[PDB]
Structures are given as C-alpha cells and as structure tokens.
Symmetry: D2
Subunit: 109 residues, 4 copies
C-alpha cells in the first residue's frame, strides 16, 4: 500500500553452508514473510547470496536486523532503504533461485 520500501543486499554464505541450511532459510522466510507482508527474491550461487526484500518500512527493517546477525552468511553488504511505488514480487513471500549445479555442490559437501 501507501508506504512501501525495498532493501537489497549481497552476502557471503558460511563456508560450511549445506542444502539443509538453504531449505531452512527458505522455509523460515516463507512462514515469516507471509505474516509480515514481506515479498521478494533470494538468489544463491557458489557461496554468494543476493536478496531483494520489500514491504512496509518497519517489517523490512525488523527482518533485516535478524538477517544481519544470521550465522549462515557474513559480509552482509547493504543498500539503504529505497522507496518503491509498488511491489516487484507481489505474492512471492520469498522466491528462491538456486541452480541444479549449486544444489549438487551444497548436497555433495
């Protein structure tokens, strides 16, 4: 609605990140983002995360304080809140992008 903001960041996955860790992150994010009216997209490849999160300012800032402390990634490199006129990922609580090749290495680890 009226007040909508986006947050974008790039982080580095913990060296020991497993496939189960990624699925945990995604399941956790589905449940919470749906309750908090947060949407966006999570991209994972070869130890690199990129996330776009969108919603009201408070929900975005509250979820980001937790994401920054999460021990499954480091070097969280943030882009200040940008005002947005409308959601880009409406109905996607957290859309995952993860190739078969990344699935294979995360699993075989």
């Amino acid at each position: 609605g009226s007040d909508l903001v986006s947050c974008s960041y790039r982080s580095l996955a913990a060296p020991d990140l497993t496939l189960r860790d990624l699925l945990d992150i995604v399941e956790t994010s589905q449940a919470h983002n749906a309750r908090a009216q947060l949407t966006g997209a999570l991209f994972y490849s070869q130890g690199v995360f990129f996330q776009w999160l969108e919603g009201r300012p408070a929900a975005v800032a509250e979820v980001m304080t937790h994401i920054q402390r999460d021990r499954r990634h480091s070097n969280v490199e943030i882009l200040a809140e940008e005002p947005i006129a409308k959601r880009r990922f409406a109905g996607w609580h957290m859309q995952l992008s993860c190739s078969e090749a990344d699935m294979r290495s995360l699993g075989l680890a």
Copy 2:
C-alpha cells in the same frame, strides 16, 4: 562414434523419494556414465522422471537393466532403442533438471 543409440523413458518416483535420493541418483550417474561414455539428461518434477540416455548400444542396454530395477521409481515406461546420428548431450554425463519448487518439496518431506 559409429554406433550410437538413444533410450528415452518416463517413470514415476517412489512416493517417499527425498532430495538425498535424487542427489544419490545424480552422483551415481555422473561417475558411471563418464566411465561408460553415456550422456543425456534427467528431468524430475512432482513425482515424474523423464530420461534421455545415449551412447553405444551395449552401455545403454546395460545401464537400463539397472535403472528398471531401481526401487526409487516405478512404472518405467520405455521407448525402444532409436539409432541417432550424433550425441545430443555431448559432455553431459547426466544433466539434471529440477526446479527450486521441486527442491523445496523433496526437502520438506
């Protein structure tokens, strides 16, 4: 080279198939197909497998006798050997196709 054949089949995944089962299949297939000069593609979605396997007749037929007995799928619905003029998936021992959504359900199970 000279004598090349393809084999195509559709099967139904075991109801209890996990993400680990899929990764096992794929790892197993990478190692063997590279030794036996077999190439192709494996597609998985929502309890359905499709595979294209290609190489010399003997390697193709030997690997298929094992795939048919594999308890991780059933109802293996085969297409007789087709002669092919050249490989379609050269250098791909077993290319996997598996969406994020299928990764999520296989994991959350």
Copy 3:
C-alpha cells in the same frame, strides 16, 4: 477416478526458435486452463518431454493437435496411463527450460 495422463518424447524441429518455444507455452497456458488440463513441458537440446493430465476426452483432443504440430517430429510411443490424482495441479503447462537452452534457441 476419471483422470488420465499422456507422456511422450519428441524431437524439436531443427530450426526451432525461442519465439516458437514461448508461443507453444503461451498457447498451452490458454487452452489447458480452459480444458482443465495440467502438466509439465521439458525442453533441452532439441528434445521435448511432455506430461499431460486430465479427463480422457480432453487429453485425447489436444494430443491430436500436438501430434501434427510442425514444431516437432517423431512424437513417440505416447504412453497413456490412468492416474489416481493430478501431479501438476495448478500448472496448466509448467515449462522447464535452462538458461543454456534459452541462449541456444535465442541464437538467431
């Protein structure tokens, strides 16, 4: 208790383009929604695999069209099975197409 699936493999027309693939998918979304068909289309390196599910009569009807479609040939020993329930509910036609294949089809 009245669902059937049809499964086949075909070989794409050698001159198939990314536009052709997109058209196939957009046409299928539209007819399948209307005819209560669901399923999955896989494309890689000149090969189609398709799983189609619905009422016998609806599956039979699209298949007669699909089989004569000129964007593929060698539509093969189509495998027809009764099913207890849909595998692809919600998916009028789910496309599977890798970035590498998108790039290849795109090369025109």
Copy 4:
C-alpha cells in the same frame, strides 16, 4: 592475492526484452573470456543483481561500460571487495533467469 569483486543491484529498463537479456549475456561471455572476468548475472521482475570478479583493472574497465549501459538504471552502491579466490571460475558470465521471467520478457 590480486582478485577483486564488484557487486551491484540495478533496475532493468521497463521496456527490457528477452532479446536484450540474451544480447547482454552473449556480449559478456565474449568480453569476460578475453579479459579474464568471471561471475554471475541474476535477473527477476525488472531487477539485476551482478557479481563480477577479476583483476582490479579489468573489473574497473567493464564497470565503467556497464554503469552507463541503457538497458538498466539505478546502478546501486556497487560493493567492491578484495577476494582470496574466484567464486565463479569457468563462468565468464553465468545467467540466472527463471522460465516465468523468460515468458515475461518474451511478451512482445
């Protein structure tokens, strides 16, 4: 001991097409192979995220071109980090682009 990465997020031109995306990727394969750059390009719903890695001088050079490229805007607080080793060796530019986004860009 002489590798750097540049990471940014940008917003695609509203009129971006699938052809535009394909061109970007084909251009990048070619220059990146030659300039010893590797990395990953992610596209979804009007948003680019890119990770680029290589020697400082090569990363600096493409970035000046990428930043003025008209197929995107709001090229954002590009995040520049020294790295111990490449994350995307072998990938001159790996594209990530879902079937749903391919369909959308295709709608022209």
